[PDB]
Design a protein around this motif. Structure first.
Motif, PDB file in Angstrom:
ATOM      1  N   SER A 171       2.243   8.360  -8.076  1.00 33.38           N
ATOM      2  CA  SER A 171       1.939   9.765  -8.312  1.00 33.38           C
ATOM      3  C   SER A 171       3.048  10.518  -9.032  1.00 33.38           C
ATOM      4  O   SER A 171       2.771  11.496  -9.731  1.00 33.38           O
ATOM      5  CB  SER A 171       1.645  10.470  -6.986  1.00 33.38           C
ATOM      6  OG  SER A 171       2.827  10.604  -6.215  1.00 33.38           O
ATOM      7  N   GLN A 200       2.737   1.575  -3.458  1.00 35.07           N
ATOM      8  CA  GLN A 200       1.822   1.970  -4.521  1.00 35.07           C
ATOM      9  C   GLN A 200       1.408   3.430  -4.377  1.00 35.07           C
ATOM     10  O   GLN A 200       1.478   4.195  -5.348  1.00 35.07           O
ATOM     11  CB  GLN A 200       0.604   1.053  -4.521  1.00 35.07           C
ATOM     12  CG  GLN A 200       0.090   0.716  -5.900  1.00 35.07           C
ATOM     13  CD  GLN A 200      -0.706  -0.567  -5.912  1.00 35.07           C
ATOM     14  OE1 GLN A 200      -0.606  -1.374  -4.991  1.00 35.07           O
ATOM     15  NE2 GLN A 200      -1.506  -0.762  -6.951  1.00 35.07           N
ATOM     16  N   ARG A 201       1.049   3.852  -3.159  1.00 37.62           N
ATOM     17  CA  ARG A 201       0.568   5.213  -2.949  1.00 37.62           C
ATOM     18  C   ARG A 201       1.679   6.249  -3.081  1.00 37.62           C
ATOM     19  O   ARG A 201       1.396   7.419  -3.360  1.00 37.62           O
ATOM     20  CB  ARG A 201      -0.094   5.316  -1.577  1.00 37.62           C
ATOM     21  CG  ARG A 201      -1.038   6.492  -1.407  1.00 37.62           C
ATOM     22  CD  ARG A 201      -1.668   6.492  -0.025  1.00 37.62           C
ATOM     23  NE  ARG A 201      -2.405   5.261   0.240  1.00 37.62           N
ATOM     24  CZ  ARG A 201      -3.667   5.053  -0.119  1.00 37.62           C
ATOM     25  NH1 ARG A 201      -4.342   5.997  -0.760  1.00 37.62           N
ATOM     26  NH2 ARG A 201      -4.257   3.903   0.162  1.00 37.62           N
ATOM     27  N   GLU A 202       2.939   5.859  -2.896  1.00 35.03           N
ATOM     28  CA  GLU A 202       4.036   6.811  -3.016  1.00 35.03           C
ATOM     29  C   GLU A 202       4.929   6.549  -4.221  1.00 35.03           C
ATOM     30  O   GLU A 202       6.000   7.155  -4.325  1.00 35.03           O
ATOM     31  CB  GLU A 202       4.874   6.834  -1.736  1.00 35.03           C
ATOM     32  CG  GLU A 202       4.066   6.886  -0.441  1.00 35.03           C
ATOM     33  CD  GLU A 202       2.994   7.960  -0.435  1.00 35.03           C
ATOM     34  OE1 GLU A 202       3.303   9.127  -0.758  1.00 35.03           O
ATOM     35  OE2 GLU A 202       1.836   7.631  -0.106  1.00 35.03           O
ATOM     36  N   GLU A 216       0.820  -1.207   0.000  1.00 31.01           N
ATOM     37  CA  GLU A 216       0.000   0.000   0.000  1.00 31.01           C
ATOM     38  C   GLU A 216       0.857   1.261   0.000  1.00 31.01           C
ATOM     39  O   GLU A 216       0.571   2.206  -0.748  1.00 31.01           O
ATOM     40  CB  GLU A 216      -0.935  -0.018   1.207  1.00 31.01           C
ATOM     41  CG  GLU A 216      -1.810   1.205   1.364  1.00 31.01           C
ATOM     42  CD  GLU A 216      -2.625   1.163   2.644  1.00 31.01           C
ATOM     43  OE1 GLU A 216      -2.263   0.386   3.550  1.00 31.01           O
ATOM     44  OE2 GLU A 216      -3.629   1.900   2.745  1.00 31.01           O
TER      45      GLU A 216
END
Lengths: 49, 115, 49, 66, 103, 201, 104
Positions: free
Chosen positions: G50, G45-47, G42
């Motif tokens: 973007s 993926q989130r960092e 998580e």
RNA sequence: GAUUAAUAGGGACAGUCGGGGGCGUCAGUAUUCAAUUGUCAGAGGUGAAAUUCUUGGAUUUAUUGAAGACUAACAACUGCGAAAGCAUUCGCCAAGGAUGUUUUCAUUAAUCAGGAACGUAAACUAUUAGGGAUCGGACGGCGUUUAUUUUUGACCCGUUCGGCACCUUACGAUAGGAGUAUGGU
């Protein structure tokens, strides 16, 4: 014969109740070369000094 | 100081002193161990590695790179994962005849699960 | 005799284990801020008239 | 009912076994649960709480899920 | 059936503690120890191996062992040997090294 | 053709360094066997530090190291010291003709009780077959859990590799020791220097 | 990434031995390992979804990702060191000299 | 008209636990095969050799692609399954264990004749009485770290069930061969 073993008496009482030298400390303990977390605390103390 | 990458494949049967550029694609000069020794018994020997390293360092100093990054390997699939005598003797002779050594790494093929 | 010697060694092991359990519960429980009750005082449960 | 939950577990096991068909641990647990069903059913027959001609092989499973 | 194989397996302790394995550290220490760099060490190892051979042939007692000790020397020797083997068993239980099983 | 000379006499540009990680039961023994290690590595020119806080042995090439194979010797030394070889043997790898090897034998037997039986069969009665293998092959063998750690010359490394695989594959090590004793007897006389020796084993 | 480069990130994370402890094995439970791996994927993926590739390399160099995994997984089980052990670029669908020279 | 609710059962629920099982999926290297380059004389084996591959370029160096296999290190005096056995991630499917409960029918049970399901090797050999470890719950808490502060988790400690194994003690127990001759066949 019958006098105190002072080291043994101090150890018995321990088991019952339970800026000029800290540079030559590092001079003697940089030679081992065990890192030994008391030396990490001594390095932080020497950095603060 | 032009760094060339020396692959030293040190097995128990023959040693491969191999010199490539930084890419890995273009072989500069290689001398195997068995082409310097008449005996297939003594093909993998410290004398063979010393002769091969001296010839390779001579060619690469004629080309003028005078600096190597050394990658040592062995037979690693189901093999031994340890280099033979060729690795130690070739690195010793290679840096004994010029050749400022840079980065040393032992890149042996280690299987995650082979058989 | 061998039975008495073996059983007093077992009794020493069990009493040392019980003392270690009580000392650990004292060092990590809220009983740490109390005076240690002496053993002669612990010998009696209650007294009544 | 204990027998009701046991036959419900039996239909669940047999449905998973029909979908998968390859494993043997579910078949062994099916053998255990059918033996348990038959023993508890026999005790309830000899008490008499249910019909003595009532039987469960697979059709009672089918007609109690249906 | 084979003889010299049976002799090499039994006397391997004595040879490898005497001098015969220069890559082993205990044998590379016992190759310079002094009781093996002396003048007739090979003959003394030969006497030890001959005593073990007659023991394998059926002798119940040895020639090389001392039979009379003042009971404090023998108790200290046996206790030190048992404590050494026990400390080796514990420091081999830790580190995961497997050892030869013997009571 | 096979002998190797000691290095007589800055060959390093990038200051190389290696690390290995050990647990606590090895941290005690390494803490009180370390001055031998750093004494011999100072004689070879490589600085060796130990970290009981994280549990890490580090070697690093100093300014005055001249032997370039010394860093490979030191890397293997700290690998064996992490893998609990005793300290004089781990320091015995620092000679010129020695080399270590780790043999992964857990992949060779599917069963567990059969694996335990075959490992104890490799170790022998009272260690006699193991020290017989060490004598006949001039190696140091350490049956280390799921692995087998051997040291010695490269010939002995190859023979103990063959013997350990054949011991795991249900051929008996007493049979293999008999084979090695026959090979030693045949290589003693050079009148039979190049024949096919399969007619004797 | 936002420049449509597909890449694989392989992260490794070793379990923290807590100081002032006596028990030798610092074993996380298997469900706790699955929760740690879920928080790891998580975070990465989130960092990493973007930014572009140049910002992703600029975050990979001082290891900001492993630091944030170390910071956010310590409520599940503390981790001794989190690194990203491999980055593999699979497909680059563009050859653009504009961005490729804006790098250099 | 209907007992103790058993320190024997079976079931239900809750948080869980597991490298238990099936199906799919995701990876990881390594090996083989093939292609593209740099090659440029051996390579491979062995104790030595030999068979073999080698100027149409072997072995090697680098990069891709395919196939089949297996899941290193973590990995244990451990975990799970009745047994053989079971180690990549994620998803689905049932099942199982232990614990806790302010959960139910109240002998349902124990044991196995008959029967039923799962399947190259061997080779050194009513308590014991607790303690130290270990993991799975449940409860409690002086506290360090999450925590910008509550959760919650990690570490330490104590209580309690349950289980693989260690040591001590037993509480006890108990289950013809080798030589040398002589005479025949």
């Amino acid at each position: 014969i019958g006098n105190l073993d002072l080291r043994s008496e101090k150890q018995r009482q321990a088991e019952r109740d339970l800026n000029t030298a800290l540079k030559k400390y590092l001079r003697k303990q940089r030679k081992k070369n065990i890192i030994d977390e008391k030396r990490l605390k001594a390095e932080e103390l020497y950095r603060q000094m | 100081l032009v760094f060339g990458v020396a692959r030293i494949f040190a097995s128990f049967n023959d040693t491969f002193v191999h010199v490539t550029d930084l890419s890995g694609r273009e072989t500069i000069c290689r001398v195997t161990g068995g082409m310097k020794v008449k005996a297939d018994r003594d093909e993998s020997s410290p004398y063979a590695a010393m002769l091969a390293a001296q010839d390779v360092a001579a060619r690469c100093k004629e080309l003028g790179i005078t600096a190597l990054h050394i990658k040592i390997r062995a037979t690693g699939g189901n093999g031994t994962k340890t280099p033979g005598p060729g690795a130690q003797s070739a690195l010793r002779a290679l840096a004994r005849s010029g050749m400022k050594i840079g980065r040393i790494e032992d890149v042996t093929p280690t299987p995650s699960d082979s058989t | 005799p061998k039975v008495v010697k073996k059983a007093t060694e077992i009794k020493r092991e069990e009493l040392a284990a019980i003392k270690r359990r009580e000392e650990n519960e004292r060092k990590h429980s809220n009983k740490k801020y109390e005076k240690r009750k002496s053993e002669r005082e612990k010998a009696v449960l209650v007294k009544q008239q | 009912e204990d027998l009701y939950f046991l036959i419900k577990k039996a239909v669940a096991v047999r449905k998973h076994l029909e979908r998968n068909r390859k494993d043997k641990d579910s078949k062994f647990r099916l053998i255990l649960i059918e033996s348990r069903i038959h023993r508890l059913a026999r005790y309830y027959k000899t008490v008499g709480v249910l019909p003595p001609t009532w039987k469960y092989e697979s059709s009672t499973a089918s007609t109690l899920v249906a | 059936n084979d003889l010299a194989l049976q002799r090499l397996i039994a006397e391997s302790h004595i040879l490898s503690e005497a001098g015969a394995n220069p890559s082993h550290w205990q044998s590379s220490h016992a190759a310079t120890t002094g009781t093996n760099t002396r003048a007739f060490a090979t003959g003394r190892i030969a006497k030890k191996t001959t005593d073990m051979r007659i023991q394998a042939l059926g002798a119940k007692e040895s020639i090389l062992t001392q039979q009379k000790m003042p009971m404090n020397m023998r108790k200290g020797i046996v206790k030190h040997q048992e404590e050494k083997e026990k400390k080796r068993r514990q420091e081999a239980r830790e580190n995961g090294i497997v050892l030869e099983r013997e009571v | 053709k096979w002998k190797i000379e000691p290095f007589l006499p800055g060959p390093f540009l990038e200051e190389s360094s290696f690390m290995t990680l050990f647990p606590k039961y090895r941290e005690r023994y390494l803490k009180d066997c370390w001055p031998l290690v750093t004494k011999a590595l100072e004689k070879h020119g490589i600085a060796a530090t130990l970290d009981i806080v994280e549990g890490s042995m580090t070697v690093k090439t100093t300014r005055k190291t001249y032997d370039p194979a010394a860093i490979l010797k030191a890397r293997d030394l700290i690998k064996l010291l992490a893998r609990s070889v005793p300290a004089p043997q781990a320091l015995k790898i620092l000679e010129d003709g020695m080399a270590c090897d780790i043999i992964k034998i857990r992949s060779m037997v599917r069963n567990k009780e059969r694996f335990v039986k075959r490992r104890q069969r490799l170790l022998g009665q009272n260690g006699t077959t193991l020290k017989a293998l060490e004598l006949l092959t001039q190696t140091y063998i350490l049956v280390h859990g799921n692995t087998v750690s051997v040291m010695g010359g490269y010939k002995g490394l190859k023979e103990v590799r063959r013997v350990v695989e054949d011991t795991m594959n249900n051929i008996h090590p007493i049979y293999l020791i008999k084979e090695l004793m026959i090979k030693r007897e045949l290589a003693k006389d050079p009148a039979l220097a190049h024949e096919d020796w399969s007619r004797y084993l | 990434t936002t420049d449509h480069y597909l890449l694989r990130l392989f992260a490794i994370a070793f379990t923290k031995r807590r100081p002032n402890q006596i028990k030798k094995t610092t074993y996380a439970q298997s469900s706790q390992i699955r929760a740690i791996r879920r928080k790891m994927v998580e975070i990465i993926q989130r960092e990493a979804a973007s930014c572009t590739l140049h910002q992703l390399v600029s975050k990979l160099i001082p290891e900001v990702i492993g630091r944030e995994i170390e910071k956010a997984t310590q409520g599940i089980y503390p981790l001794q060191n989190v690194h990203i052990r491999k980055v593999k670029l699979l497909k680059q669908p563009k050859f653009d000299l504009g961005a490729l020279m804006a790098l250099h």
